[PDB]
Structures are given as C-alpha cells and as structure tokens.
Design a protein around this nucleic acid. Sequence first.
DNA 1: ATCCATTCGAAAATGATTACATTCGAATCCATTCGAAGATTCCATTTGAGCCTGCTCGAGCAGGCTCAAATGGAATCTTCGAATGGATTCGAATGTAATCATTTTCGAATGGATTCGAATGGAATCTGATG
DNA 2: CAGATTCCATTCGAATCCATTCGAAAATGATTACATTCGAATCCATTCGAAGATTCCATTTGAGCCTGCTCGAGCAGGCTCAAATGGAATCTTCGAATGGATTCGAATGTAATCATTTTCGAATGGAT
Lengths: 104, 96, 81, 78, 96, 97, 91, 92
Amino acid sequence: KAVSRSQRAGLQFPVGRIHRHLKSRTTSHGRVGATAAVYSAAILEYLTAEVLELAGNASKDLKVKRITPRHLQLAIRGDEELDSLIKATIAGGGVIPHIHKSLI
Amino acid sequence: VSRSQRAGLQFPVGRIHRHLKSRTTSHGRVGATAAVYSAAILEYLTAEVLELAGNASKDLKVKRITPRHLQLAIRGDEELDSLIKATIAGGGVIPH
Amino acid sequence: LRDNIQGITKPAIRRLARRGGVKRISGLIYEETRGVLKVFLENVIRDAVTYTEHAKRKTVTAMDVVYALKRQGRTLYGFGG
Amino acid sequence: NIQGITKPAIRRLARRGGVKRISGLIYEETRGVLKVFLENVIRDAVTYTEHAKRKTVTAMDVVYALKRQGRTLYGFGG
Amino acid sequence: PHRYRPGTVALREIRRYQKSTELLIRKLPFQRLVREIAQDFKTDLRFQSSAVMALQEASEAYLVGLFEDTNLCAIHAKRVTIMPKDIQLARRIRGE
Amino acid sequence: PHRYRPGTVALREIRRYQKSTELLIRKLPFQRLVREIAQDFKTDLRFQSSAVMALQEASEAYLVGLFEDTNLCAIHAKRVTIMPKDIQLARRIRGER
Amino acid sequence: RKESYSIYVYKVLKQVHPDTGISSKAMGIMNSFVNDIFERIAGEASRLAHYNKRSTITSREIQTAVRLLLPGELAKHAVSEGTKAVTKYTS
Amino acid sequence: RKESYSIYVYKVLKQVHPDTGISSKAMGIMNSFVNDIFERIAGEASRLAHYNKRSTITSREIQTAVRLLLPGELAKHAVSEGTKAVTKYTSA
DNA sequence: ATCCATTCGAAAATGATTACATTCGAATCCATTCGAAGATTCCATTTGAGCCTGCTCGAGCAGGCTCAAATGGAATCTTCGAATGGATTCGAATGTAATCATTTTCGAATGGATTCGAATGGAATCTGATG
DNA sequence: CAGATTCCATTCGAATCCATTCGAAAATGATTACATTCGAATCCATTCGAAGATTCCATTTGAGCCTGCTCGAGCAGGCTCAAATGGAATCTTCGAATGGATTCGAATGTAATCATTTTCGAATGGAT
C-alpha cells in the first residue's frame, strides 16, 4: 500500500507539495533534501495554530460563533511576538481603542 | 572582437553573463543582450560617482581620492543620496 | 477631470483624525493632509502602471497594486497572495 | 564594562551630532541604547558563525548581520 | 436650549470611530481622484474595482498612522491642538 | 584671569568634531564590552580585529544619527537642552519602541 | 484549477477550537500569511546555502533560517516542533 | 584566486579624469557599491520573470527593473545608455 | 622622513568560434466575462452663519544646574616575543538525491439545505449640566 | 431633567458546510552519479605577558544663563440649525479586452579546440 509522508511525520500540511514548491526556488543547479520539507511543514503548522488559537479566544470573548478579520487584528496586535513578526495591513480590522490620559 | 569591444564598453560581458546565469531559479535561461544592458548600466553609474568625487577632490586641492571625497559627493546630490543609503567607512558627517 | 482633490472634504479628514485619537484640530490641517495624500497616491500609482505596462495590458488589476505596495514596504493582506 | 564608555565620549558624539547643551541624565539612557543595539547585532553574528562550524567571528558575519538589520556598511569586504 | 461643553462630543466621536471597522471616505470622489492622477502616466487606461478598493484601504491606513504620530508630537509640546508643525516633524523623523 | 562665556566653546567643539573623520570611543574599553556581551551567547569565542572595527563604526554612526533626531525633538519644544524624553520620542516615532 | 491552503487551515482550526467557524475573508488573510512566511524562509535558506559554497539544502539550513527572522520564544518553540517532526519521520 | 572589479573601475576613472588617482579604501568602497547594485537588479529581474509565467530573462526585464529601482532623471539616462549599447551590439 | 600607488613578468583559468537539437514564445482566430456610459429617485450628508467659552501666547520673577578652569594621576597605546590553536587543502570511500514507468489516492469546482448574524422595536440605565 | 447608550424579542436574508465527478499529482521500485564526510599536513593569526612616557580623565569651586511657575488678555475652534446638494443603488445596453488553441520560426544550451586575459610575486619613486 501507500502511506503519505505527512502521516509518517504526523502533520496536516503537505510534505510532497511543499517539497515540489521548494525545488522551484533553488538557484541554477540546486538540490533539496527530503527532511527540509518536514521542517518547513512543522513550522508553518505551528504558527498557524498559534494565530488561530488567539483569534478564537478573542472571538469567544465577544459571544460570537465565527471568526472575522476584526478578531484576527485584535489577536495579532495584542501579542508582542505576533505584532513584531506580522507588520502587514489587515483589510477590515481597524484600530485598537486607546485614548491618551491628557485628553480625558 | 570581444563582446565588450563589440558593444563599446569597459565592463565584462562574459563574466556578467556567467553571474546572471547562476541566479535564475531552476531550468531558467538567460538571453545574450541582458548582459550588455547590465554592463551599460553599471558603467554609467560608476562613471557618475567617480566624476563627482573627482570634482570634489579638485575643489579640495588634492590629487587622490579618499572615502571623505566619496561621502561628500554622495551626500551632496539628491539622486545619489536617495539611491545610496549605506555607511561609508571613513567619511564622517556633512557640516551643518 | 480637474480639482478632484477637493472631494476629500473636511468632515472626512475630521473622521480620520478622530480614529487616530485627536481631540482638537487646527484650521490649516486639511491642506497638509491633501498634499501628503496626493504624494503617496502618485508614487503607488506610478509603480502599479509600470507593472501593468510590462505585461502588455491595458487594464490595471489588483495584483499590480499589491506588488507595488509590497515594493514600497506597505504589505497588504486580503486582496491576493 | 558599560561604564568604560565615559562621559566625554558621549559629549563628543553629541557635539558631532549638533547638540549645544546636554542634561545630566543623558549618559545612562545612552548606555542603555548602545547596549541594546550591540546585543541585537552580536546575536546574529554569532548565529552566522555557528552555522559554519567555526570558533572565530570574522568580518563577514558582522557585515551580513548588519545588512540583515537594515544598516548596510561599505568598506569591510562588502 | 440644551448645549454640551466643548470637548464631550469629541470624545464620543473618538469612541464611535475607534469601535468600528468601515471606510471613512466616500467612494466616488476617491475613484475620480485615482483616475485623474493616473491620467498623467498612460492615456486610455482601465481599472478593476478591486484595484480602487485596495488603494483606498492602503490610503486610509496610512493617514490614520500619520495622525497617531502627529498626536504624539503635539502632546510633547504641552498642547492638545495639532498643527502643521507636528505633521512636518513626524514625517521628517520617519525619513519621508 | 580670562574666562569664556558658556556657549562659544560648545560651537567650537561642534565645528572641530564635525570637520574630522576619526573615531570617538576608545578601543580597549569597547573591545572589552563587545567580548563581555558576546560571552552570553557562546563560551570560549575568538574575534578578528576587523569584526571589532566594523562594530565600532556601525555603533558610532547609529549614535550620531540618533542625536541629530534628538536635537530636532528638543528644538520642537522651545529648548536648547536635550533630555531623556526627546530620546524616547525619537525612538518611538522611528519604530524602535 | 488553482492551489490553496484552505483544507489544512480548516483542519488545524477544527483541531484547536472544535466549535468555532471561520468566514471567507479571514480565509484569504490566512492564505496570504502562510504564503508570506514560506517565501521568507525559502529566501533565507537559499542565501545561507550560497554563503558557504554548497548546492544542497538540508534541515540545518532550515533550522538556522528559523533561528533568524523569528523573535523571542517563537524561535525556541518552533525549533522544538520541527526537531520532533523530523525525528519521528526518519525513524 | 579572487575576482573583483578593480581593473574596470580604474579604466573608467582614467576615461573621465585622466590626471587623478584613487587609493585602496575608495577602491574597496566602489567594489561594494557595484556588487550591491548588481544583486538588486538581478533579484528584481527574476521576480518580474516569475510574475508573468516566463522562463527566459531578456532586455525587457532589465529595462523594467531599472525603471522600478532607480530614481527619476537617473532612469532616463541609464535606459538611453543601455538601449544604445544593445543596438550597437546587434548591428555590428 | 615615511607609507604606498602604479609597472613589469608568467601561468592557469576561461571566453570565443562552429555545429546541431529542441525548448519556447510570436501570429491569427474565436468566445465570454467585464468594464464603461445613461437614466431616475429618496434621503442622508455637506455648507454657511451666529454665539460664546476655554485654550494659547507673552511678560515679570525666582530658583536650579550646566559649564569653564586648575591639579593630580591612572590607564590606554605602542613595541617585542614565544606557544600553539585552529582554519584550509588534498585524497579515497560513502550517502543520497534525480530521473523514468505505473497505479491510484486526493483536492478542486459545482449544487443544495440549515442557520446565524444583520435591521427594527422597544425598555432600562448612565451620564452630563445648570440650579 | 433631557440625551445617549446598552440590554432583550422577533422575523429575515445573506452565508457557511456537506455531497459528488473526476482530473492532476503523489508514492514505489531500480539505476546512476554527484556531492558531502572523514583523516593527515602545513602554517598563519589570535591570545597572553612585559615596560613606560604621556595624555586623557576625574574631582572641586564659582556664577550666570536657562528653565519653570503665575497671571492676564484675546482669539480661534466647537456646537446648533436651516437649506441645498451630490452620493448610493437598481437596471440596460454596448463595446473594448483577456485568455485559450494550433502552427511555426527565432534563439539558447551543449560539446571541442584554441587563443586571450586577469591575478599573483617583487620594485620603486611619488602625495601626505
């Protein structure tokens, strides 16, 4: 029979497709090992799970069942490391409420 | 009959072709007139910078060129200042 | 088309300032805001039209804008990638 | 060892920067800023050194780390 | 007649516009402005709708960030009013 | 005895240190500081002279630029004396805070 | 037909929060995020391989490239997860 | 062995300023500058080729990369110089 | 006086020419999405004008605190010199990633049934301002 | 005491999740070379120790220039209301422009054989 490589590694993200994608970015004569794909898939899955967990907590706070870009922005900008890593613009997020003490 | 002499340049065309061929992902080809264009651009930029630095040296009444002259020339031109944002080791600061 | 920069009214600038967190506003802020907006738009649109012209096309797509914004250092999530 | 960056050295750097008068609490702030910058750069220099299985920190590791940070430097091999 | 002291409705609008997520500029004037600006680079162009909307989102985010920096600079000088000097200083420090 | 008013020698020092190109921090203390900082990441390390020189040049350039921005912030608030709040504001606007 | 990361993002989400859904715009944002991070890691790995005059890319290059560009405790946890995955795979 | 751009920089300098020399440190700085610009142009050209689903790199890619990277009034002169060189190469 | 920038001589990479083999990207036609130009209403948003209050600016005093000068004296700089430590090169012997040929499992596009947030319709507090 | 903002109820309509057909692609099995790893052999280049003349640095004192707090005048931005205006929104038609197929024809890589060309040694007389 056939056993997928992601099942052997114990992941959800694909190992074969990521291997094929990595082989297309090597300059000129360049080979790619079989255990670079496993490392890359594990990294991507870890980061995805972290962001999704924070966003789900933010959504649960507001008594809502689904996730929207507002919750993604609230989750990202409330964490120091995620804020440092992600500096892009999220279309539909807005700003975190904050009013200076001198103006009040 | 070298390619550089046929195009009328001083920078190398074969060496630049070889350099370009080694940064083109997988199964990527490089034309023969990309090297000529690249060599022309590099020669033009080098000549501009050298001309400005030499004018500054003639202003300062010296014969050679030092990193101080390069810093003075680069910081005094708007386009060169915008393009080059690196640190020249031995230039100082522009008086102001 | 002429003097289209005056369609960025004074209430719109006031709303953007309020979302920024500003309590009081002077009377000469609006012209400065219009100037800075024009400069930003000119840069981005120039790069987007260059990207479109390279591909031998006549329609400006969302991906040219996304690529230009990534070039300037202003990555945007939501419209492609 | 951070106290070996004295007060006259900071005065000289401020004078070259254009400053006419200096407060008395500037020196500790400047020392903190310098320490943070140095740690940030040396971390990546040592990472680059360790990847190549070496025990000596060369000039190219520092040049690459600076270029990564966004502070390109000319005249030291790149 | 009922009146509010100067400065209460301002805080009400601050909360209202910081709690929401929509766009704050009208769409037709912005589209007209985009077309007029792009008239100078190539004649007889066409635009998707997504291109205009991406441009609007980027512009709004840029202006909001700039106004936050301007407010910081205005607070530094012991004021609550923002003036063109704060915009100029904020843009100068950011290297713009 | 002869005395100088405070403010002219400052301008003389400004001109003198802006016309030159040398280094302003002494070498042995900076070398010791660099080694002590780097001992946190790996033990029994070695350095080249060029590494320390590159680090010194980069550090000096960074500090001079920061002090220019600090002076701008000090002038904004109608002063000539620079204080820590100016450094904090400059670093906050730049993106480091 | 075109490729996307929607299936795996939904699988991870159902693994973390088993009763919370996702919309369609948040899916586009997650797709863009994954592509961005992948391109960053790939570029850094290629440069690292170039510096030492080698042609092949291995898990050492990926580990070093993760040690850069990833701040704080993210780097430690990511390296731990990747090492565990590779160790399980090879055996 | 170790290749560099010293000979060509000296030739250009003797072309523009026939009576001026150049020291070693300025030569190192010029080498760094040339390498930096070349790497920038090459990367941008590769990205342009990728975006359009092509495989070959031609003078169109280089021209567009130059237009994207160089500031105004510096792109016009560079484009003119490159076009003249390519035409002279092809005609001969 | 002293450091160094330009010349001269050889030798080992390494471009330049000729001849295929074959990817690869121009040249014409045809469909379809898709963007531009017109037309017709409500109704919400923008534009002036009047009123009045609170925030910004300038001046006279007072206290805080940075700078300029003189005297020790200490610690960075320059030169000399072993001891040895670790990068760098050259060979054989391995480890493993690429390339065909099959077979089948997987993920992408199109349809269909709940279902959960998006407008009304109120009621209950919260808060602001003049007395 | 008059305005504004946070709670619950009810019917609705936009939106997500599950089901199906089937092409595009991933895993298995041999066979080759290609690239990386494991021992010696120089031999530079970093670290440690010593001597000392001198120049930077640290401490104390005096005083005047800069900053901070109080007060009064005025001036420029906020708040309310009536009248007018231009955006949104819901169809209709038309015409300009991509995107996919099928042949071709222009152009690049690969393999040998020279015939240059650039980098590594000292050698001096010259700007600093």
